[PDB]
């Protein structure tokens, strides 16, 4: 997150860190949202390959023992069948990870609440992106979970030529684009939490930014619209 502030430890208990085996250790590579004690929702491009993954829930500082983490392996990955690695702009950037064991819920570990299917937020709706992604374009990962206020940019505006044009689809949510705050590498797969009827719910799965940089004025961070996949999500969980 560029332009973020450190989140309090218990503000975003559904946020997870998806890590892959690197050398003799584990390396954070993407964010995710715990949606069942044994299922994590993330971006398909994060799990599109042949890497070995573990999920860390209750994580705050990637480089220090928080005394709250649970580590768990990923037993099965279900990527959206329509996901095309060669065209992230086509959409379907979402995958579900079935965890080897159910994690235990507590103030650091909770299920992310999902919006009702079909929900599209009014322009400028209040949301927050969270993650350990880069703190500057071409910079380094944050050590502690960061958050940044990123109001939505509705489809009509997001799809206009000075913004994302044809690149954005209605199956996505655009948020931010203020030139200062944005998602950045390592935030992919993470939640966009939006306040609706007094409850924060996860309306987006972090997907992409401008080739020009993370915080680029009028190139809001783009997310997969969670509300477009509620039936898909429920069908996967019901069958695995």
């Amino acid at each position: 997150v560029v332009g973020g502030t450190e989140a309090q430890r218990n503000s975003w208990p559904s946020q997870i860190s998806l890590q892959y085996r690197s050398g003799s250790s584990w390396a954070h590579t993407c964010g995710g949202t715990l949606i069942r004690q044994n299922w994590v929702m993330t971006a398909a491009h994060c799990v599109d390959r042949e890497l070995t993954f573990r999920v860390v829930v209750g994580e705050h500082n990637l480089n220090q023992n928080d005394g709250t983490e649970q580590y768990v392996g990923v037993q099965k990955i279900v990527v959206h069948p329509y996901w095309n690695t060669d065209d992230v702009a086509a959409g379907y950037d979402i995958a579900l990870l079935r965890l080897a064991q159910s994690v235990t819920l507590n103030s650091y570990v909770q299920l992310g609440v999902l919006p009702r299917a079909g929900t599209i937020l009014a322009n400028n709706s209040p949301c927050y992106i969270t993650g350990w992604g880069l703190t500057r374009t071409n910079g380094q990962l944050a050590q502690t979970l960061q958050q940044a206020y990123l109001p939505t940019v509705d489809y009509a505006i997001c799809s206009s030529s000075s913004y994302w044009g044809s690149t954005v689809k209605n199956s996505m949510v655009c948020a931010g684009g203020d030139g200062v705050r944005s998602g950045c590498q390592g935030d992919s797969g993470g939640p966009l939490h939006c306040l609706v009827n007094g409850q924060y719910a996860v309306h987006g799965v972090t997907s992409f930014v401008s080739r020009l940089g993370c915080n680029v004025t009028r190139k809001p961070t783009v997310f997969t619209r969670v509300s477009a996949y509620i039936s898909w999500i429920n069908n996967v969980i019901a069958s695995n």
């Binding site: 590579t29 993407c30 950045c184 590498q185 390592g186 935030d187 992919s188 961070t221």
Partner: peptide, 11 residues
């Protein structure tokens, strides 16, 4: 550009 670390094409 997708937001996987180090990159989409390079973990």
């Amino acid at each position: 550009t997708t937001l996987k670390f180090p990159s989409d094409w390079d973990d």
